[PDB]
Ligand binder design. Structure first.
Ligand SMILES: [Ca+2]
Ligand SMILES: [Ca+2]
Ligand SMILES: [Ca+2]
Ligand SMILES: [Ca+2]
Ligand SMILES: [Cl-]
Ligand SMILES: [Cl-]
Ligand SMILES: [Cl-]
Ligand SMILES: [Cl-]
Ligand SMILES: [Cl-]
Ligand SMILES: [Cl-]
Ligand SMILES: [Cl-]
Ligand SMILES: [Cl-]
Ligand SMILES: [Mn+2]
Ligand SMILES: [Mn+2]
Ligand SMILES: [Mn+2]
Ligand SMILES: [Mn+2]
Lengths: 237, 237, 237, 237
């Protein structure tokens, strides 16, 4: 039903729905079966940064994930998003835990979108930055198990009062205002997103991952989308 | 009911509710009776620019209105907005026509708000810019007679198919996302707004003006607020 | 001697040094013989906009040139600039006239460069914007025939007191501060440049073009670089 | 000789040249004898943040200094800088140690200046941000004892190989490009600066302080300006 473009930080290989056989970062165009992936060493308990970049000129969606020691994974995919997404969208973050589990903690999130016309100067633009999340975060739409705490963090999936990640959890956070991410007459339609995160588990394996996504304005968690579907897709096709 | 902080571009003197006896720009703190005003030469049919600036350090709300020939009016008012506004707000533009009339055309509007904590780097932030308005402007909430056209403009009050401003009109446009404009622990809470406008009339006098405003999230046009109340206040007190 | 990376707006085909046989936009990596070109309809006497975009993740230098009626040309080239440029650079604009001539007028120019480390937040950054040039432009280094006028424009090549472009002219403008455009540990090193321009001629054909370029800090106009070498290269190899 | 506007973080009271009898933050208009001060609790060994704000509309130079525990000092001064400074300037940071000493370590520094004309959109602008300083910092001019290290910091005054601050030291760092901080036709000329710092001493008292300053482009350390003159002024008048 929904239309999804996503960058996934996938901690758990589900090798029978196309995942490679290692943790990986991927670009998802209307399917959980990534159009392109790269091997990712998730560092348990450390704070990672993800950077996502697209412009309508180069037409290349790119995504790098790094940790402070310097190890990083990158994935790029050539795609014209004018042909995938509706003109108006909501942008958001998603995360899942299923049979295996992890914290899906967001410490900060920023986004910029710009439409530059022909036309001579300038420009429609939207920019937000969160370095601290609050308990009543009025410019965020929280779906499912997602919560904003008193500790300044966004917590996408269930965590218990002792700091333990729960299994079978799904949560999303979407920015409140719709975003105008393309316009047929824009000479440049570009966007960038950045988020920092803390994934930790005392579990045999961490699962399932975190994703930045762009969707139709009325997007909601699809029925049965915990575990490997990352709160983004109603099936694995 | 609503809480209003506003900068008004007041084209029409209503001298029995406190207006000075000339067109004027003013700072409105919870009353249409400006806390401070300056004389303003509105230039019929020309494109003006208004710039509005506040920070929580200097605690001074300032506002300059200029035209291309260089003539400008400025007004400043010392005020601590932490003590006036709720923490979460919506920001918007308002305009009125009553017995006399004018176009209240907005050609562009931009806003930035930032919260900088102690704490060491950075920062919550919100920035939007509109240089072109569209027919279905999904990130704006249009109240009353306000319309976005096919001509890339925001039209706050009624205009007829021949380009004639109608009397007794009220319209507002508010940005879709709530804004976090103060937080007790922010070392700096600042905001800036800019808009461009075209006020024109073949009328004996233009009325009633345009305002940039900040309000509670659930703000709506008060009953009977056309003419001199500028779509902001339910009375003249 | 110098190291050059450039986007050229080439108005004049020199078909024996590799130009295609039409006006074209191109990406120049250490040679006037573009690595990649696209056909460009230069609109005599109209104000064009050029947008140039690169990031170290997608590793794709892209460049679109448009006019208000909407016609635009785009060119993209995959290149890792970490392997071409020195770490510290100056950025600038260049233009030429030779046997044929044109105005090479710049009406505005903006640039942003960012280095984002691993590392967790943020960032080294440089941003400038010129919408008005002044007679004594202290943050620009003017080379050759380039002048800043009283009319708010940057004029790269010779124009006479009657507004006529002179032949055999070369001029460049470089931003005063060196720019740190890559750093081996930056997870993201990106840059964007935008300029607007007015190319006009009553000449049998316009020549020779305008270029945005990045060079070593001590870059200067190479000996004999008028006409087809665009003030960038000491030869045509 | 030089023209100085400064915000000083003054750790050491020199009560016979006008200092109050406590550590203080102050606004300096062409004199070390501050036009306005506020009491400042310098927290030995902690990372402080200073924020400096001015606009040509409100005409109020403001400055807050904070630490992570939340304690902050603020000082504001009404002044029209169009009447104090030359149009073109350099911006910088200064620090001193004399008979008593301290580290004057800068961990980050950012600056934005904007000129908005009448005129309708936009704008000349300059923005830099340093979160990491490098050993060969080509966009900074280092004066006196100031050094940039391998540890990513700017070190304004002498420190010895064991990490001990030396007495009688003076150092400054100025951004490489001149800045156009006012223009008589700008409807808005505004600026903001932010820096973070680490002042530490095992000394009977810390001295002498750190300052952000704006000066003529050709500004240099005045003869005999260590200790209480903070590297800014040739005398105490
Ligand atoms: Ca998976
Ligand atoms: Ca009135
Ligand atoms: Ca050529
Ligand atoms: Ca002192
Ligand atoms: Cl599975
Ligand atoms: Cl399925
Ligand atoms: Cl009345
Ligand atoms: Cl009333
Ligand atoms: Cl030739
Ligand atoms: Cl040659
Ligand atoms: Cl003394
Ligand atoms: Cl003295
Ligand atoms: Mn996957
Ligand atoms: Mn009034
Ligand atoms: Mn060519
Ligand atoms: Mn002092």
């Amino acid at each position: 039903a929904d239309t999804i473009v996503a960058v996934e930080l996938d901690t758990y290989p589900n090798t029978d729905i196309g995942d490679p056989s290692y943790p990986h970062i991927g670009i998802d165009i209307k399917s959980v079966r990534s159009k392109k992936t790269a091997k990712w060493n998730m560092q348990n308990g450390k704070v990672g940064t993800a950077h996502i970049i697209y412009n309508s000129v180069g037409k290349r969606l790119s995504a790098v994930v790094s940790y402070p020691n310097g190890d990083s994974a990158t994935v790029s995919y050539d795609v014209d998003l004018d042909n995938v997404l509706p003109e108006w969208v909501r942008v958001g973050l998603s995360a899942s835990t299923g049979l295996y589990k992890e914290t899906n903690t967001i410490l900060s999130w920023s986004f910029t979108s710009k439409l530059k016309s022909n036309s001579t100067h300038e420009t429609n633009a939207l920019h937000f930055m969160f370095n601290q999340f609050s308990k009543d975060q009025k410019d965020l739409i929280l779906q499912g198990d997602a919560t904003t705490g008193t500790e300044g963090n966004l917590r996408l999936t269930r965590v218990s009062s002792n700091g333990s990640p729960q299994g079978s959890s799904v949560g999303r956070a979407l920015f409140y205002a719709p975003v105008h991410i393309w316009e047929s007459s824009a000479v440049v339609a570009s966007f960038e997103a950045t988020f920092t995160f803390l994934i930790k588990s005392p579990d045999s394996h961490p699962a399932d991952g975190i994703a930045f996504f762009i969707s139709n304005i009325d997007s909601s968690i699809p029925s049965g989308s915990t575990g490997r579907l990352l709160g983004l897709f109603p099936d694995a096709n």
